[PDB]
Design a protein around this nucleic acid. Structure first.
Ligand code: K
Ligand code: K
Ligand code: K
Ligand code: K
Ligand code: K
Ligand code: K
Ligand code: K
Ligand code: MG
Ligand code: MG
Ligand code: MG
Ligand code: MG
Ligand code: MG
Ligand code: MG
Ligand code: MG
Ligand code: MG
Ligand code: MG
Ligand code: MG
Ligand code: MG
Ligand code: MG
Ligand code: MG
Ligand code: MG
Ligand code: MG
Ligand code: MG
Ligand code: MG
Lengths: 131, 88, 59, 92, 300, 31, 101, 151, 75
RNA sequence: AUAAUAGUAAAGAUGAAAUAAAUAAUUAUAAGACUAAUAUAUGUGAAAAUAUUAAUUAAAUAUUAACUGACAUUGAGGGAUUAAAACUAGAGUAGCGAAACGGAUUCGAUACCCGUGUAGUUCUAGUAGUAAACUAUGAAUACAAUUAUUUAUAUAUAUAUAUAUAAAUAAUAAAUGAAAAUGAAAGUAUUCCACCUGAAGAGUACGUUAGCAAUAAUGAAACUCAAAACAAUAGACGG
């Protein structure tokens, strides 16, 4: 099944804002590819201010690095990833939504589909045939 | 053909029964399972009238017997306890 | 058999374009039964049933 | 450090609630009127009053049904009045 | 038969129109057909419609949408004022000219493919001119076309290897050119939007040909003077020209050097006074509007 | 049946409930 | 006074045709009465054919359909179809749960 | 490295219930040497400046002005209590920095407080008020309210 | 893991652009032109992302019986 | 609820009242229950029910193609599910709240209003099978005159509407009806099931079956009476 993870990582060090996000993406990506899974895309969303002050593991946060990760795995692996994210102190909020593949095998991230690009081939073919 | 319909229902019955064994309080899908099992009985009862030779061949291959098909069945609480549907 | 179709079809197309005849090919001539290594032998190793269906449907 | 000092203005107003008005030093009574409009367009006074006492779900459903009917009935009434006025203007 | 007669009846001649009779947007041209009744028929509320128009109506001109409705009334507005805008334009005797120097749309000119060198610009305009098309009916232009174009694959898999084989073995820069031409050549026979609904030229506002001089008892008229009104007392924001109301049209007025002092004096009531203007040129835009340029002739 | 008529059944049900509570109480003391 | 409130004067666009009635107060009142946000469709993503549920991670677009306090607007105000209103509300509720809106 | 407590603004909070009106005047104090402390992260600094400590200066109710029992929840009680607050803010030299008014509920004293601040009684305080806001607390489901009163 | 390390570096790099969704960025046809060309040309297409026509012509001795035909014509 | 902080002297409640370093404000911590807008319960579900988010499993739509060849309808008995309250066992217990104990009101107040608030309301595993469990309207099939409004599928184009065919809802013709009204049924017909035969006695008594229990199902007769009931009409009256 195709899944879309949206994680809000903590920005502890203002000098290295995209450090825990890179370390986290590697941890999650390794779980996926080591359990028969495929990582289709990793779309960084940048530092954004949280809608409110949020709390996690007796800590407070006002900003986080947003990142998206489109990956293919089994339901058991998807639940394992979610369990690790809900326990990691780095992760402030994490959501995994299923992306239906009943009609087509290649679906882009919701962010891209919102912009009209329905498949990764459309994104790649707009970076080769026109770039 | 009635034999094909019974076989196709058997696959779904087997899958639905496995679901119920893990979701014993899912009464909505227990009701669906009951109706599907009763539908399979109806199609096979017609087959026995239409082509008796195929009927006996079909039920033997599916693992059923004439009694399972002709006898009134309600998949009630006594059945769940006499055949240990949920185990223990 | 670690040998893969793609790799085997990449040796029958390089040996047929370079002239090399390592014993692997003889083995490949047994893995697939393709005694002769020509451009019209890889095309018959990769035939898909769909192609036959398309012609039966036209008839 | 100063990085945490020069980035507090937006941060302060980035977590807004939507129930605040910047007072117009000239006409300070116009800002209180603007705040009142927000309260009524978010039904804040009505919600607060409706949360003072518990109402049974059946009664809640009845009131919601009746209120919707009255809202739709008023829209149908206004549509018919517009037709009357237009018909009168053309001499019907 | 009765059906044949009905198709040719005067009511059938009026094209179906459901456009709002009360429109508050920007009006660039007439939207409804003006209906006129003679004085004798008006005395009897006869307009050639289904039902008698209410006697309150004293005008002899109306515009309507529906002959009858569920409300048992006719949907009409007793106005015919777009005819006076056209007749006032005729009185100003300013021919409409093309700012792009295009051929006259009212003459059957022998045109050539000079602009047809943009075959890939307009052949794809059929699928790319979908600014306001449904999200799925426009998507039906992708599979429906793909099958039609895919049915010409065999024809183009032989013509291209018989007329330009070198390109197929060297580069596709020219192959793409042969593709755009192929479809158009095989589409000119087809009828895709064979009827074009775009406004043709002036749209009927003026059928006057440029060139003629206006003879007068005081000699040939060299500059057309027309009374008008200045709407704003401050030039259009971001534009170096004010706006005037001349003959039912809003024009852009250019002043000689300075703005008359009556502007500051009058202020927002400047529209209450009438000035004399000179109509420099009149152009037609694709939206169907008329771009009238004027000049505030001031007593000197 | 109307509310008026329902009220007669209501009274009969109340008197039966009142009598059964009364009987219960006695059994408790007599037990 | 040489000044008039904008609400008491109509500015005729350039290139448009007008009637004498366009200078009256009736035109002013008539334009107020029939002033509807009909140009929203061309600027309304959710009235274009896109699935509102694909915007659950784009709070900026979703924030156009909630009040200042975050209350989802009734369909009477949004003007969306039943399906889009249903999908849009789901997107907003999901966005709120993820921690973005 | 040294406590440098300074006032940044004042908060005038009004709680307008059905039976009383409570008016609190507070000071938003900021230790201007907080960033000069050791072992302080960028997050702790930003979190300290996003919710600065507050100190209560004036606390008033309608019973402090002599209104008793049922009179405490009336319009006149709130208007006079609002005046006494606007006076005590000038008599304590607390009208130098900007004031932010926070109103809580919609009792009869809410409109009296607004009238007393947009009128003569609050002509000094109103000049310093920079932001007005509402802080009415609503519940999304939450605890069960008491049963409706049959009266 | 090699692909993962290369992807992470290329996406979380200062040079890389990140979808911050703060403004309506400005600029279909590209992907629609690849479809049109692959529908007309088919096997004899120049698109990097071709259709099954090319794979069908290969296994049907068409892309080869046409290459020889073109070359024979050139002769 | 607890703690801190400054800051004070009243606070809380009501028709008005009185009963039990505060209230208010800003922080921090803990716990249980609930689910604002959207929202129409629209829709979905056999009914009961069902609206904070995600995931897993199961079920559910339309058209087309092929296939089976009456395999269907209804359904006694039977089976399954079934709100709230109640009960058994173990956890939980913020708020609400039978009872109980107090404060008021009143001529009296075993009430309505206020306080303190136990069971219960929550979760897990069970028992029980009852509601104005209501559309007070069993299910299925064939059929009959219109309009309006949505929804869905399809078709077309001079590309955004237009034309079709279903479904839903609203108002109706006919028809039906004691009328109120029903309106695609409460119409025209067919098939199957449940149920009724004056009121009161009575859904009671007795027996039986089932349940830990409360109870649930089944379910009379005597005596007495010439009543009793529904729709609608005109009044009178209404804090
Ligand atoms: K419903
Ligand atoms: K037969
Ligand atoms: K039967
Ligand atoms: K039965
Ligand atoms: K409790
Ligand atoms: K009901
Ligand atoms: K029945
Ligand atoms: Mg059956
Ligand atoms: Mg009855
Ligand atoms: Mg009071
Ligand atoms: Mg209580
Ligand atoms: Mg407190
Ligand atoms: Mg809700
Ligand atoms: Mg419904
Ligand atoms: Mg049945
Ligand atoms: Mg217990
Ligand atoms: Mg009490
Ligand atoms: Mg049970
Ligand atoms: Mg009972
Ligand atoms: Mg019953
Ligand atoms: Mg119910
Ligand atoms: Mg059925
Ligand atoms: Mg009983
Ligand atoms: Mg009656």
């Amino acid at each position: 099944m195709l899944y879309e993870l949206i994680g809000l990582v903590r920005i502890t060090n203002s000098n290295a804002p995209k450090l825990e996000a890179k370390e986290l993406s590697s941890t999650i990506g390794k779980l996926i590819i080591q359990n028969r899974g495929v990582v289709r895309d990793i779309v960084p969303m940048g530092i954004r201010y949280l809608p409110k002050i949020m709390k996690k593991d007796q800590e407070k946060h006002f900003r986080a690095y947003h990142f998206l990760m489109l990956f293919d795995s089994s339901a058991a692996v998807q639940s394992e990833i979610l369990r690790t994210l809900k326990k990691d102190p780095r992760v402030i909020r994490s959501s995994i939504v299923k992306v239906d593949l009943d009609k087509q095998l290649d679906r882009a991230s919701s962010l891209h589909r919102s912009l009209g690009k329905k498949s990764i081939l459309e994104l790649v073919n707009e970076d080769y045939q026109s770039i | 053909s009635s034999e094909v319909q019974a076989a196709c229902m058997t696959v779904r019955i087997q899958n639905m029964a496995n679901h119920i064994k893990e979701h014993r309080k899912d009464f909505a899908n227990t009701r669906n399972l009951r109706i599907l099992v009763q539908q399979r009985q109806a199609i096979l009862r017609y087959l026995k009238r239409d082509n008796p030779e195929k009927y006996y061949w079909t039920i033997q291959k599916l693992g059923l017997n004439d009694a399972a098909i002709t006898d009134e069945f309600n998949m009630d609480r006594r059945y769940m306890q006499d055949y240990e549907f949920f185990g223990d | 058999e670690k040998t893969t179709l793609l790799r085997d079809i990449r040796t029958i197309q390089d040996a047929l374009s370079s002239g090399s005849t390592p014993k692997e090919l003889l083995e490949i001539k047994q893995r697939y039964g393709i005694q002769d290594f020509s451009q019209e032998t890889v095309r018959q190793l990769l035939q898909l049933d769909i192609s036959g269906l398309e012609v039966n449907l036209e008839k | 450090a100063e990085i945490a000092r020069s980035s507090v203005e937006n941060a302060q107003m980035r977590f807004n609630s939507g129930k605040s008005i910047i007072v117009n030093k000239n006409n300070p009574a116009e800002s209180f009127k603007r705040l009142n409009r927000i309260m009524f367009e978010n039904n804040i006074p009505g919600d607060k009053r409706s949360q003072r006492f518990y109402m049974k779900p059946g009664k809640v459903a009845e009131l919601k049904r009746s209120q919707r009917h009255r809202k739709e009935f008023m829209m149908g009434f206004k549509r018919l009045i517009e037709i009357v006025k237009d018909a009168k203007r053309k001499g019907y | 038969t009765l059906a044949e007669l009905l198709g040719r009846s005067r009511i059938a001649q009026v094209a179906n129109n459901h456009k709002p009779l009360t429109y508050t947007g920007k009006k660039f041209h007439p939207t409804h057909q003006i209906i006129e009744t003679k004085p004798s028929t008006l005395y009897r509320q006869e307009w050639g419609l289904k039902s008698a128009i209410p006697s309150k109506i004293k005008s002899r001109y109306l515009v309507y949408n529906d002959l009858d409705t569920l409300e048992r009334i006719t949907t009409f507005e007793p106005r015919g004022g777009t005819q006076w805008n056209r007749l006032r334009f005729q009185e100003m005797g300013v021919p409409i000219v093309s700012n792009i120097g295009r051929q006259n749309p009212f003459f059957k000119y022998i045109s050539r493919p000079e602009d047809e060198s943009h075959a890939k610009l307009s052949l794809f305009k059929e699928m790319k001119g979908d600014t306001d098309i449904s999200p799925a009916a426009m998507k039906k232009r992708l599979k429906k076309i793909t099958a039609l174009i895919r049915s010409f694959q065999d024809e183009f898999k032989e013509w291209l290897v018989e007329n330009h084989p070198d390109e197929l073995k060297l580069n596709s820069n020219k192959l793409e050119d042969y593709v755009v031409k192929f479809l158009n050549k095989k589409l000119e026979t087809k009828t895709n939007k064979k009827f074009n609904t775009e406004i043709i030229g002036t749209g009927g506002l003026s059928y006057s040909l440029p060139g003629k001089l206006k003879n007068s008892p005081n000699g040939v008229i060299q500059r057309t003077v027309v009374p008008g009104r200045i709407l704003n007392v401050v030039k259009e924001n971001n534009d170096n020209k004010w706006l005037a109301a001349i003959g039912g049209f809003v024009a852009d007025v250019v002043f000689f050097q300075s703005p008359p002092s009556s502007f500051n004096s009058m202020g927002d009531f400047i529209r209450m006074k009438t000035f004399l203007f000179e109509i420099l040129e009149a152009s037609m835009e694709k939206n169907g509007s008329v771009s009238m340029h004027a000049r505030l002739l001031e007593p000197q | 049946d109307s509310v008026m008529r329902k009220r007669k059944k209501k009274m009969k049900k109340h008197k039966l409930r009142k009598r059964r509570k009364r009987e219960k109480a006695e059994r408790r003391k007599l037990s | 006074t040489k000044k008039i409130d904008q609400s008491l004067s109509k500015k005729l666009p350039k290139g448009t045709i007008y009637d004498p009635f366009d200078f009256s107060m009736g035109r002013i009142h008539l334009d107020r009465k029939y002033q509807a946000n009909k140009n929203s469709n061309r600027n309304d993503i959710m009235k274009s054919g896109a699935n509102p549920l694909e915007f659950y991670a784009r709070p900026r677009i979703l924030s156009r359909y909630v009040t200042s306090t975050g209350r989802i607007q009734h369909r009477d105000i949004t003007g969306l179809s039943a399906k889009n209103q249903r999908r849009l509300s789901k997107a907003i509720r999901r966005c709120q749960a993820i921690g973005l809106m | 490295y040294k406590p440098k407590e300074e006032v940044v603004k004042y908060i005038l909070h009004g709680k307008f219930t059905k039976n009383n009106t409570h008016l609190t005047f507070s000071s938003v104090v900021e230790d201007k040497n907080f960033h000069k402390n050791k072992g302080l992260t960028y997050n702790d600094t930003m979190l300290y400046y996003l919710n600065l400590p507050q100190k209560v200066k004036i606390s008033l109710s309608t019973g402090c002005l002599g209104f008793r029992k049922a009179a405490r929840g009336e319009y006149e009680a709130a208007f006079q209590t609002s005046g006494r607050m606007f006076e005590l803010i000038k008599e304590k030299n607390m009208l130098n920095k900007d004031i932010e008014v926070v109103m809580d509920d919609f009792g009869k004293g809410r409109a009296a407080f607004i009238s007393a601040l947009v009128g003569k009684e609050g002509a000094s305080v109103v000049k310093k008020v920079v932001k007005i806001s509402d802080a009415t607390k609503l519940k999304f489901g939450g605890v069960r309210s008491p049963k409706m009163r049959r009266l | 893991e090699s692909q993962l390390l290369k992807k992470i570096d290329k996406v979380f790099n200062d040079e890389t652009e990140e979808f911050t969704d703060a403004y309506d960025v400005t600029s279909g046809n590209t992907t629609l032109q690849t479809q049109i060309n692959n529908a007309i040309m088919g096997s004899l297409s120049n698109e990097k992302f071709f259709d099954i026509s090319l794979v069908d012509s290969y296994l049907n001795k068409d892309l080869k019986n046409i290459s020889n035909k073109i070359d024979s014509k050139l002769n």
